[PDB]
Amino acid sequence: NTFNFSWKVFCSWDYLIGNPETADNKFNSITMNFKEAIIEERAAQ
Amino acid sequence: QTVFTHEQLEAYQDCTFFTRKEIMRLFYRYQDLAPQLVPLDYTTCPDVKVPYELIGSMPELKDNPFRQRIAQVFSEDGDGHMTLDNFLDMFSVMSEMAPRDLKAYYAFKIYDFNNDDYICAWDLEQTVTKLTRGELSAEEVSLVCEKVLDEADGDHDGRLSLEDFQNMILRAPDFLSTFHIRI
Ligand SMILES: [Mg+2]
Ligand SMILES: [Mg+2]
């Protein structure tokens, strides 16, 4: 809980990714995850 | 007919987490990036750099949004152009065998975009932007950056020191799993 956004910013990119389709999917996944977290955070506000 | 002296290979083993056989394999990976620039005999102790453009386009880095920063951090002069020593050091730190405290230290350097020994709201803005390819709004980015500082700025100065960063990241269960390059 206490490092929710911190771990999203610093433990999200998988440095083993070496294919552009896999990379595209990961960017989409990360971005959607940030949006979900932002939605919950404003609700907490 | 040899790439290295025994002493040179002993020295690379001493300063990396690689076996002698791995140093040989990685040397050929480096030489193959620019075969008209990198000599095949390193007993001459050459002073040669592979340019960043060929490093960042390697299979192991080409899809990483932080590839330019990674090469900058490990390069001799901070411009991403790499000697053999720089290249070995980069893959050594990023290998699965590197200890977590060493990795956290270099992760800190990668994400400290302005190279001031701190991760501030501006450094965080760069990190979040690259992670989402600019698909969050500037306001959306600001919230994330502010939350990270709220969560992780332990000494309450508005920015992440190395100590702030290490306290946050050494807890994270997926740091070692994701901050890893295999070669
Ligand atoms: Mg900084
Ligand atoms: Mg601080």
CATH number, residue B109: 1.10.238.10
* Residues of the domain holding B129: 100-178
Between CA B82 and CA B76 the distance in angstroms is 6
Which of B35, B41, B40, B39 lies closest to B54 in space, CA to CA? B35
Sorted by sequence, the CB contacts under 8 Å of residue B53 that are 6+ apart come out as none
Phi-psi region of A9 (alpha: psi -120 to 50; beta: other; left: phi over 0): alpha
* B159 known member of a binding site: yes
Cα–Cα distances (Å) from B157 to A6, B96, B118, B120, B151, in that order, read 17, 33, 11, 10, 13
Interface of B with A (CB under 8 A): 59-60, 62-66, 94, 107, 111, 124, 127-128, 131-133, 135-136, 140, 143-144, 147-148, 151-152, 165, 168-169, 171-172, 174-175, 177-182
Interface test with chain A among B29, B147, B149, B169, by most A beta carbons within 10 Å:
B147
Which of A26, A3, A33 lies closest to B148 in space, CA to CA? A3
Name the helix (H) or strand (E) containing A27: helix A20-44
> Does a structural domain hold residue B1?
no
Between CA B55 and CA B61 the distance in angstroms is 8
> Does a structural domain hold residue B48?
yes
CA B137 to centroid of chain Cα atoms: 28
CA B82 to centroid of chain Cα atoms: 12
The residues facing B50 across adjacent strands are B82
Looking at the fold, whether B138 and B70 belong to one and the same domain comes out as no
Q: For chain B, what is the domain count?
A: 2
**B41, B70, B94: which is the final residue of a domain?**
B94
List the alpha helices (DSSP H) in B4-137.
Answer: 6-15, 20-33, 52-56, 67-74, 84-94, 100-111, 121-131
Cα–Cα distances (Å) from A21 to A9, A27, B67, B135, in that order, read 21, 10, 17, 17
Dist. CA B103 → ligand 2 center (Å): 20
Q: How was this structure determined?
A: X-ray
Dist. CA B125 → ligand 1 center (Å): 11
Looking at the fold, whether B77 and B10 belong to one and the same domain comes out as yes
* B174 known member of a binding site: no
Between CA B129 and CA B12 the distance in angstroms is 37
Q: Check CB contact under 8 Å for B172 and A35.
A: no
Handedness of CA A9, B165, B177, A6 (dihedral sign): negative
Between CA B173 and CA B38 the distance in angstroms is 40
Looking at the fold, whether B133 and B74 belong to one and the same domain comes out as no
Nearest-by-Cβ selection for A20 from B63, B165, B177 = B63
Between CA B67 and CA A15 the distance in angstroms is 9
> Does a structural domain hold residue B152?
yes
Between CA B96 and CA B180 the distance in angstroms is 6
Looking at the fold, whether B12 and B87 belong to one and the same domain comes out as yes
**B72, B94, B116: which is the final residue of a domain?**
B94
Maximum Cα interatomic distance, chain A, rounded to a whole number of Å: 39
Residue numbers in A near B133 (CB within 8 A) = 27, 31
What tokens were used for B65?
């949004």
Looking at the fold, whether B45 and B115 belong to one and the same domain comes out as no
Between CA B110 and CA B23 the distance in angstroms is 24
3-state SS assignment for residue B78: coil
- The answer to whether residue A40 neighbours chain B at the CB level (below 8 Å) is no
> Does a structural domain hold residue B183?
no
Between CA B161 and CA B167 the distance in angstroms is 10
CA angle B36, B60, B52 (to 5 degrees): 45
- The answer to whether residue A18 neighbours chain B at the CB level (below 8 Å) is yes
**B94, B128, B158: which is the final residue of a domain?**
B94
Q: Which residue has the tokens 């740091």?
A: B175
